[PDB]
């Protein structure tokens, strides 16, 4: 009987579209077969990922090597995004940046032939049994030091005059930093917002007290908002079981979804050392962290209020399962100490938890169920863990 929270499950937020992570097959090897069971299967010992995310390569012969892996992805249930990092350089010319010489931008006078690129892609992609869910106009248009950069200006011009033309739904901007000065001039023109269906963002450095978005709550209606590139807390090599690190995975997923109200998460390449599978073939300690929610909160979930922070070094999130009223709970205790948490869940007539919970010297080990008195569950989280209740 230590700190207390409150589930509220009337007050429903953001609906859940899912977790997962990249595929570059021309940039690094392709997922094997294995691994794409591994990622997108929700077995025991996989992610349970529901979000593919792959690259437009700037070279149309490249496109056929995306196809086995993102076709796998979909017959497992999973969605496929696709972002662009070029136009074909035919479409491409120089600029001076900042002072910096020979920067890259899409010409003025090719945004029609850049749509009829993306186009393409969408097109053959369908034709190879990969119906996309969205194309992004842009990876990281604020950050293009090594591929194609967007003004805020040249990003709206886009949006407003020429995204309306593509086949699919449009993503955008992908600021690397989830920098508001990408997507405010888009939410704030009514036609470039029309033709927006999914606000994209990564998070590098993205501080939680940037996670909010009071223009996208006011003007955002009807449109998804997905975090669709991080590695977090740092990209080193061979650093994905590095524990007690891995938590930090755990804890800006949790800020994601309660701070930012993000619908989707999505890492960077899934197979890689400091990433949520590792190099052969099984699930890193990141990849515990992500599979706490991306194994038990389902696309079309619903997260719902709840006290985010009930005592210090304590994180929990909510998500209603609204056929049934179910609920899956994701709480996070960094301290080194153990904490007792009663969970008020008013109203539900749910009475028994199950519970697995990873720490740094168990995955997901499953543990005793959880038996509410009334509508409270008292919970006891070891220290330095993770638990998922189901």
Not at 191 to 198: E, F, Y
Request: neutral net charge; hydrophobic residues 35%.
């Amino acid at each position: 009987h230590m700190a207390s929270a409150t589930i509220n499950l009337s007050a429903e937020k953001q609906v859940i579209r899912g977790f997962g992570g990249m595929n570059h097959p021309v940039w690094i090897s392709d997922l094997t077969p294995q691994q794409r069971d591994t990622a997108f299967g929700n077995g025991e010992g996989q992610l349970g990922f529901t979000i593919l995310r792959i690259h437009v390569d700037e070279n149309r012969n490249n496109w056929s090597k995306e196809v086995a892996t993102a076709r796998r992805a979909i017959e497992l249930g999973a969605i496929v995004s696709a972002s662009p990092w070029n136009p074909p350089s035919n479409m491409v010319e120089t600029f001076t940046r900042n002072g910096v010489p020979n920067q890259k931008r899409l010409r003025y006078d090719k945004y029609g032939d850049y749509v009829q690129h993306l186009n393409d892609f969408v097109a053959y992609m369908k034709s190879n049994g990969v119906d996309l869910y969205a194309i992004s106009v842009q990876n990281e248009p604020d950050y293009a030091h090594e591929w194609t950069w967007w003004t805020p200006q040249e990003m709206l011009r886009f949006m407003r005059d020429y995204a309306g033309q593509i086949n699919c739904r449009v993503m955008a901007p992908e600021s690397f930093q989830y920098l508001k000065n990408m997507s405010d001039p888009i939410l704030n023109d009514p036609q470039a917002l029309a033709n927006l269906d999914i606000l994209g963002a990564h998070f590098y450095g993205t501080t939680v007290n940037n996670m909010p978005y009071p223009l996208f709550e006011q003007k955002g209606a009807g449109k998804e908002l997905w975090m669709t590139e991080v590695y977090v807390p740092n990209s080193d090599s061979n650093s994905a079981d590095r524990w007690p690190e891995a938590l930090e995975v755990a804890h800006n997923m949790h800020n994601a979804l309660v701070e930012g109200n993000f619908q989707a998460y999505v890492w960077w390449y899934i197979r890689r050392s400091y990433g949520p599978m590792k190099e052969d073939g099984t699930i890193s300690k990141r990849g515990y962290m992500m599979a706490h929610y991306s194994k038990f909160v389902r696309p079309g979930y619903v997260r719902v209020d709840a006290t985010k922070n009930p005592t210090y070094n304590v994180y929990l999130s909510a998500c209603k399962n609204k056929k049934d009223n179910s609920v899956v709970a994701v709480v996070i205790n960094k301290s080194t100490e153990a904490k007792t948490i009663n969970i008020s869940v008013p109203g539900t007539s749910i009475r028994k938890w199950e519970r697995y919970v990873t720490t740094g010297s168990k995955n997901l080990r499953k543990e005793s169920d959880i038996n509410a008195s009334g509508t409270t569950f008292q919970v006891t989280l070891e220290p330095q863990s993770v638990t998922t209740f189901v």
